[PDB]
Amino acid sequence: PAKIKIVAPLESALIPGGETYQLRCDIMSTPAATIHWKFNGKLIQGSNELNVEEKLLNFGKAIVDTGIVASILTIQCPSAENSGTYSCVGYNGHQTIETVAEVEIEGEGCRHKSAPEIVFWTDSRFEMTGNVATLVCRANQQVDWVWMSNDELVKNNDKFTVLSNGDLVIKNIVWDDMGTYTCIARNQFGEARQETFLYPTAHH
Amino acid sequence: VPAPGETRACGRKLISLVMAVCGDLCNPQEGKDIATECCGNQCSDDYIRSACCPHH
């Protein structure tokens, strides 16, 4: 049965102007959820789009698809225009949830040519042995992606596909695939990294 | 048996999932036992979700 729950909520805050600020939320969901953010009710990051491709790849299978997704919203140079209500919204195709906070800027040399950031990722994905699973990372711009596992490059082959959007798609998962997969987003100025985690559950 | 580094990463992610499902029904010391069990041995989805709070 589908389920969704806040794991790490937003909290309201009076923050200094002109100092970089970051919000984080984490949501548990089955099937996999996406997160988008709103400011005073208006969409500012992310979308409601879901992993339709993996659902096709798991045609005919009993699917576990559960885990925690995380997202971060960065305000580079907070000013009075950034004061208001921030919402982190989760959606899994069946249910929604949200966590909300009021952020107020207090106070008035704040800065381009910077590394990307990874703003949404699979903190954990559980899926049954024998199915396809996806580890998701999304950046704040178009990027070049590389994935690592066990300190080695993940190469594209019959089992692993690295997509241009930041997904790593792993077919026919087995217990030996359990562990951490690091997504690395690069542009011409530098890189951002994030860890994701896969758990292939037992198939009885 | 998983490599030790995969067991390491697993323990944190598994206890987080168990605590999120079970809430206050799962003491962190009991979630840790399920995390250790299921990060050295492969567990089912049902066991991971229910072992720390069998009455849901």
From Swiss-Prot, chain A:
Expressed in PVT, ASK, BAG, M2 and ASI neurons. In L1 larvae, expressed in pharyngeal ectoderm and mesoderm. Keywords: Disulfide bond, Immunoglobulin domain, Repeat, Secreted, Signal. Required for maintaining axon position of PVQ and PVP neurons postembryonically in the ventral nerve cord (VNC) by preventing axons drifting into the opposite side of the VNC that could occur during body growth and movement. Residues 1-104, 116-199 form the Ig-like C2-type domain. It is found in: Secreted. This is Zwei Ig domain protein zig-4. It comes from Caenorhabditis elegans. The chain holds residues 43 to 248 of 253 of the full protein. Disulfide bonds join 25-88, 137-183. One of its GO terms (cellular component) is extracellular region. The gene is zig-4. It comes from the Eukaryota. One of its GO terms (biological process) is neuron development. The keyword Nucleotide-binding does not apply. Disruption phenotype: At the L1 larval stage, display defects in the positioning of the ventral nerve cord (VNC) axons characterized by axons of embryonically generated PVQ and PVP neurons, but not of RMEV, HSN and AVK neurons, from the left and right VNC drifting into the opposite cord (axon flip-over). These defects are not enhanced in a zig-3 (tm924) mutant background or in zig-3 (tm924) dig-1 (ky188), zig-3 (tm924) sax-7 (nj48) or zig-3 (tm924) egl-15 (n484) mutant background. In a zig-1, zig-2, zig-3 or zig-5 or zig-8 mutant background, cell body positioning of ASI and ASH head neurons is normal. The keyword Secreted applies.
UniProtKB/Swiss-Prot annotation, chain B:
May be processed by serine endoprotease bli-4. Belongs to the insulin family. Disulfide bonds join 10-39, 22-52, 26-53, 38-43. Disruption phenotype: Severe reduction in Ca(2+) signal in AWC neuron and in chemotaxis in response to high salt concentrations. Probable insulin-like peptide which negatively regulates synapse development at the neuromuscular junctions. Probably acts as a daf-2/InsR agonist ligand to prevent dauer formation under optimal environmental conditions. Acts on AWC sensory neurons to regulate high salt chemotaxis responses. It is found in: Secreted. This is Probable insulin-like peptide beta-type 5. Expressed by ASI and ASJ sensory neurons.
